[PDB]
Amino acid sequence: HSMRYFFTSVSRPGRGEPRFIAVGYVFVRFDSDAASQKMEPRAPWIEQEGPEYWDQETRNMKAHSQTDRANLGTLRGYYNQSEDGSHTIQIMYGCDVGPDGRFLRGYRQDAYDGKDYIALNEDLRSWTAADMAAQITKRKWEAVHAAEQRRVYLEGRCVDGLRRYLENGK
Amino acid sequence: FTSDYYQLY
């Protein structure tokens, strides 16, 4: 019983603002070029969560869309990649839980252009970099104790949300 | 549920 959030962020140059896909997995799909412009669900057992969840999550990943725009602009500098256009980000954070629903292990490995990037370990306190630019991300994600906060999310709305998800089976 | 802690690169 996992909880994965594959956050596909394609810059889609030319036409304008980046075209964002937020397919998550246990589910949901935030196509930023769809018609709803709200967090349209793609799972049966998520409808049972009401306006205390739909609006909250919708605004949360509306914020996450701008966060991914900013981080994509950041990797324009980090890798110093070609500014010719499209460059896809693949976020893959999440956490596993035992059948008991407690935090088994967490995993936040980043993937820019298919390959590897900063990756979280089994200890959930220290990441594991992948190249020269990843160490810059290490610096800021270990300085602000972002490891602790992503831990308590993975020991948190990851664990608690997956608890509610397992409870969704009545 | 899509952590409201979206940490930046």
Epitope: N60, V144, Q149, V152, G156, R157, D160 | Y5, Q7
Partner: T-cell receptor
């Protein structure tokens, strides 16, 4: 956070004893906020992980103690400028991962000269 | 710092007010605080890039909203006597546990009957 002493009386050069007690159902992510007069709250020091004996701005320090469940802001040398309302803020991290800062009722450290 | 307008304001009962907060350059998270002499510093509500992430314990007549450029505004419509306090705004990077929290100088309001 429950700051017990509303008015702490410390002479110039005595161990500051700004008592902070926290009651949380989770790990202590503690923070000290000094509210200088005619200004807003400024950051003093934090304990997230690592050494129990922490240090912060303006020479302040704290001793996170599990033996007392307390986070006393201690300062061996007292200055008159220390006369401010000190807030002990525990950031109860929401399940999502956003910090909701819950402060104490305010300790009026007068630092009597 | 977090520049705040209006700095100080007076209104009557039932009148509408609007307070403005602009975070630090590059900061995209904004919190709102209210400082009552009696109850201390209370959390109002926190915004993060057009998204209210957290909210405190205040009546339904306390509302706020943040635009695309991280600028946030707070407005109060039906003014009761308990609305006399200092209203603080905060900033952050993304709601990091160790990103500190730059607070503003606040706006103090009092409601004359």
């Amino acid at each position: 956070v429950a700051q017990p002493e509303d008015q702490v009386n410390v002479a110039e050069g005595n161990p500051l004893t700004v008592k902070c007690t926290y009651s949380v159902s989770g790990n202590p992510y503690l923070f000290w906020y000094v509210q200088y007069p005619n200004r807003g709250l400024q950051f003093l020091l934090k304990y997230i992980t690592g050494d129990n004996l922490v240090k912060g701005s303006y020479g302040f320090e704290a001793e996170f103690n599990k033996s007392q469940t307390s986070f006393h802001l201690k300062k061996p040398s007292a200055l008159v400028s220390d006369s401010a309302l000190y807030f002990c803020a525990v950031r109860v991290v929401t399940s999502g991962g956003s910090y909701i800062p819950t402060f104490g009722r305010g300790t009026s450290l007068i630092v009597h000269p | 710092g977090v520049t705040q307008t209006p700095r100080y304001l007076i209104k009557t009962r039932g009148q509408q007010v609007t307070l403005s907060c602009s975070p630090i350059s590059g900061h995209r998270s904004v919190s709102w605080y209210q400082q009552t002499p009696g109850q201390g510093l209370q959390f109002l509500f926190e915004y993060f890039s057009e998204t209210q992430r957290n909210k405190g314990n205040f009546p339904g007549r306390f509302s706020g909203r943040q635009f695309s450029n991280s600028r946030s505004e707070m407005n109060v419509s039906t003014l009761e006597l308990g609305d006399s306090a200092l209203y603080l705004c905060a900033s952050s990077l993304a709601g990091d546990l160790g990103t500190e929290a730059f607070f503003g100088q606040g706006t103090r309001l009092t409601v004359v009957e």
